Amino acid sequence: ICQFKLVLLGESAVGKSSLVLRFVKGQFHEYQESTIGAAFLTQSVCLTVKFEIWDTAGQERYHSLAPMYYRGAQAAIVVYDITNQETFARAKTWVKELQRQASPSIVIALAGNKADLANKRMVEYEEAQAYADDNSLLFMETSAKTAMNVNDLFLAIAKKLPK
Amino acid sequence: KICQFKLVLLGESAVGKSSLVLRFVKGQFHEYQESTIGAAFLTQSVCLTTVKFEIWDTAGQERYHSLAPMYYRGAQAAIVVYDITNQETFARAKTWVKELQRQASPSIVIALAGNKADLANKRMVEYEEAQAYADDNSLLFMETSAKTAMNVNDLFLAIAKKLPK
Ligand SMILES: Nc1nc2c(ncn2[C@@H]2O[C@H](COP(=O)(O)OP(=O)(O)O)[C@@H](O)[C@H]2O)c(=O)[nH]1
Numbered sequence: 001i002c003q004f005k006l007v008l009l010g011e012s013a014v015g016k017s018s019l020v021l022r023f024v025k026g027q028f029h030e031y032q033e034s035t036i037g038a039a040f041l042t043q044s045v046c047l048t049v050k051f052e053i054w055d056t057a058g059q060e061r062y063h064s065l066a067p068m069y070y071r072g073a074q075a076a077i078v079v080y081d082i083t084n085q086e087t088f089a090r091a092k093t094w095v096k097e098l099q100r101q102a103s104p105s106i107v108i109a110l111a112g113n114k115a116d117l118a119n120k121r122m123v124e125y126e127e128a129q130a131y132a133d134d135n136s137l138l139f140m141e142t143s144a145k146t147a148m149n150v151n152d153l154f155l156a157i158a159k160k161l162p163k
Numbered sequence: 164k165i166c167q168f169k170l171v172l173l174g175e176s177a178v179g180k181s182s183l184v185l186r187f188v189k190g191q192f193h194e195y196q197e198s199t200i201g202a203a204f205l206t207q208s209v210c211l212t213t214v215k216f217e218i219w220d221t222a223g224q225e226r227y228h229s230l231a232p233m234y235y236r237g238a239q240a241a242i243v244v245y246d247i248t249n250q251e252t253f254a255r256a257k258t259w260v261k262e263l264q265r266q267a268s269p270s271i272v273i274a275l276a277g278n279k280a281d282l283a284n285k286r287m288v289e290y291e292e293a294q295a296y297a298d299d300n301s302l303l304f305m306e307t308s309a310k311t312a313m314n315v316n317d318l319f320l321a322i323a324k325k326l327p328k
């Protein structure tokens with residue numbers, strides 16, 4: 001079993017907490033408090049890769065916390081909301097921050113969350129894909145609400161990590 | 164440069180959480196008044212860069228550990244209070260330190276306050292047990308008196324110095 005630390009980043013309300021709860025606990029409850037209720041949570045994927053997952057919900061404003069959150073992190077997911085263009089712009093700022101401040105070996109994924117609300121889409125799939133490709137990022141659209149692509153994002157990260 | 168943070172107070176009922184908050188925020192103490200800060204939260208600052216605290220009291224809510232998600236969400240600091248005249252309160256402070264370490268952001272700054280230190284002629288919690296305990300858990304520690312204001316401002320100052328700039 002390989003075990004790694006993974007951090008979730010992104011604007012408040014994009015779905016960071018929901019994504020971690022869906023992956024770790026299997027479930028979703030709408031309008032819950034925006035937190036994972038735990039200092040960190042753990043879950044695995046079999047190829048076995050075990051993730052210790054740190055959420056930044058409630059802490060998004062505090063970029064000087066970066067040293068602590070990124071120390072010993074092997075992976076990160078930057079999350080945006082596909083219905084909110086500003087959150088995609090914001091995601092780029094965190095991708096940049098990871099690139100400048102996290103370990104040079106960190107595996108970064110971008111998640112376009114709330115893809116169940118594709119009718120209210122404001123960030124084009126092809127736009128985020130090009131951006132992800134330009135930055136050597138993993139990219140998927142996700143829905144914590146339905147579970148669409150949630151486990152599979154963590155699996156894609158697991159495959160990119162060292163053995 | 165005003166950094167503003169959220170701070171939560173934990174500890175057994177009657178240790179002095181509400182008194183400590185009112186002393187820092189309003190400057191004053193009134194003995195035997197209701198165990199509440201009379202506000203959803205209160206704000207006060209410390210100048211170093213000015214650090215502003217939005218302070219949540221748990222007085223009246225101590226039983227309900229299931230509220231922790233809401234209280235700890237977006238919190239950057241916490242103070243766990245005990246009463247230096249009451250050993251069970253110190254034993255209890257350890258339970259809340261453990262709850263914060265398990266359930267709050269890993270980045271949270273945690274302080275330990277031995278309150279009612281003005282009643283040193285009724286002391287039952289050894290300062291050295293408390294200090295050793297604080298050291299083992301990477302906590303800030305001071306004894307305080309909401310009643311006289313001894314060390315109350317300086318406790319929040321010490322927390323402010325440890326928080327991110
Ligand atoms: N429709 C939809 N709502 C979601 C999704 N993920 C999260 N939410 C909701 O969006 C709000 C914010 O989610 P939350 O996980 O707390 O975001 P966080 O602040 O980034 O941790 C809550 O009401 C969630 O239930 C999703 O994939 N689809």
Ligand SMILES: Nc1nc2c(ncn2[C@@H]2O[C@H](COP(=O)(O)OP(=O)(O)O)[C@@H](O)[C@H]2O)c(=O)[nH]1
Nearest residue numbers: 177179180181182194195198222279308309310
């Ligand atoms: N002697 C003394 N009494 C205090 C001190 N702090 C609080 N008290 C008193 O202890 C009682 C409980 O305090 P309170 O602040 O309501 O505790 P809380 O339930 O933790 O909010 C009240 O009668 C306070 O006036 C202190 O530093 N010294």
